[PDB]
């Protein structure tokens, strides 16, 4: 268990965490009108496999993707405070959804801390 | 009283790990990005000086360049755990390059970790 992906448990938790997401994204009145597909499938498997490479795991996102420009890819898209909030919320409702076994306080304490800082940072809009 | 940089073969071994390191990152999808297309050479020179003078070999780093001030030095690209991985990963495959011969179990072992701390005091942005 020494990477933070491993720790956590992998691509299984990240797995669980970011469809559990993506399901919340798919009725959110918010961001619905921001992410730009009706089929969400892809844009799941992005945030997935960076998620997971961010934290130590695989490559694969840099290996379909590139090097994360992550400011460039979301400036097609208008996200105020509105959305960093909805984002924020759907995230934390998913990785709620993982139990304590999985991810332990320090490890859950640390990723929450992570996507709140990257979802502030990630603001680009005033409205 | 023989010196780390003597110890393990001196400018011949330094050359040897920064120019591999080099020739990893040019393959590298994360970091191809990051360092300047235009500058590899003088950017391979700096990077082996400092090298060389960081483990008690020549000083000509300093001379030329001043203190490291490694953290300015690095405030103007974005590197998060991403590009932080992505150097260590390069840097593992130059290191594991050089024979144990050459590089023997204690030393190859505190070099790592010093690369190891180091890049993660440089670690600078979210993504
Ligand atoms: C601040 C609130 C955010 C909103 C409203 C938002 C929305 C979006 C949208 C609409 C896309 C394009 C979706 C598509 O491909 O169809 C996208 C892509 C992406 N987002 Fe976010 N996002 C937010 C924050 C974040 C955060 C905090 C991260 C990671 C720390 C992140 C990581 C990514 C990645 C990796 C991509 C795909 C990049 C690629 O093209 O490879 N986003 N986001
Ligand atoms: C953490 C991931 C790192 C990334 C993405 C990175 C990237 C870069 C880039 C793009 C440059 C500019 C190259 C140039 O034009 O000289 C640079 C410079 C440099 N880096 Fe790094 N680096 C990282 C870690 C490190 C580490 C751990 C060290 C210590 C061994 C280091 C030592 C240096 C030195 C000495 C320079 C040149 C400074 C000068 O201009 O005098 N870097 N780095
Ligand atoms: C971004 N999801
Ligand atoms: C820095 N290389």
Sequence with gaps: ???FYDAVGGAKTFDAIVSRFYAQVAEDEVLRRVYPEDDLAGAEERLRMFLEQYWGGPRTYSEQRGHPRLRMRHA????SLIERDAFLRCMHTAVASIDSETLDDEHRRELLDYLEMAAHSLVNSPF
């Design 76 to 79: 097609p898209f208008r996200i």
């Design 1 to 3: 268990p020494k990477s």
